[PDB]
Design a protein around this ligand. Structure first.
Ligand SMILES: [Cl-]
Length: 246
């Protein structure tokens, strides 16, 4: 990225709920970004389900996902969340964060092709060890908020090393709010509640298109109690509202 500037005034939205986290916000491009915590902005964490973004692109690139209208059928066997116990489109599986759908995508991509594309994407530490179907959930893969916004800006610009059509397919799957002159693409993640002295991580990453401007953002926070999870959206939303983005 370009320049990044620490703005400690944003910390008021964190301390209010005793949250340790970072928000990175870039206007127009990574030319100029702002953050509440420069050290944490470059610290790398498990991506959890924010990894569905590169995984979906790689699945399309490799042909494992045949096209954007593929239906991922539920075999009827129990899944960890009831919202996953149904047939899903690609967008549906991303939007409900259907881990088992993407675990099978990763298995079929395989370790050689997965490694190749994370290198091409400069995705975090590019470490896929720990099992092909779980390296982003409990393995050694790590990515920073800075790296997320660089990756997302490349996607927005169709500059990732993947076909433009596959990048466009994944982008429509990430739309979460649509209005005439306001468009949000975003993705959550949550590694879990961690262990004693080692909290989990929660994420919200995406970008906002308002009129003729675009803003890229990445948020993460330490979390050891699932009741705090909605803060991964509310804190960055309050910050973006205070910046006039909404
Ligand atoms: Cl499951």
């Amino acid at each position: 990225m370009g320049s990044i500037t620490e703005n400690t005034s944003w910390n008021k939205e964190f301390s209010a709920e005793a949250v340790n986290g970072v928000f990175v916000l870039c206007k127009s491009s990574s030319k100029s970004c702002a953050t509440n915590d420069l050290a944490r902005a470059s610290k790398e964490y498990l991506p959890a389900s924010t990894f569905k973004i590169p995984n979906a692109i790689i699945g399309l690139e490799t042909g494992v996902i045949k096209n954007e209208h593929q239906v991922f059928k539920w075999d009827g066997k129990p899944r960890a969340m009831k919202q996953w116990e149904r047939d899903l489109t690609l967008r549906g599986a991303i939007q409900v964060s259907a881990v088992p759908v993407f675990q099978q995508i990763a298995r079929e991509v395989g370790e050689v092709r997965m490694q190749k594309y994370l290198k091409k994407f400069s995705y975090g530490n590019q470490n896929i060890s720990g099992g092909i179907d779980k390296f982003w959930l409990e393995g050694q893969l790590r990515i920073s908020a800075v790296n997320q916004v660089e990756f997302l800006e490349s996607l927005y610009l169709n500059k990732l090393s993947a076909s433009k059509e596959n990048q466009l397919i994944v982008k429509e799957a990430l739309v979460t709010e649509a209005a005439p002159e306001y468009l949000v693409h975003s993705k959550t993640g949550f590694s879990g509640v961690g262990t004693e002295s080692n909290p989990g991580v929660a994420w919200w990453v995406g970008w906002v298109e308002k009129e003729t401007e675009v803003y890229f953002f990445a948020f993460n926070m330490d979390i050891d109690n699932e009741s705090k999870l909605p803060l991964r959206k509310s804190i960055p939303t309050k910050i973006m509202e205070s910046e006039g983005i909404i």
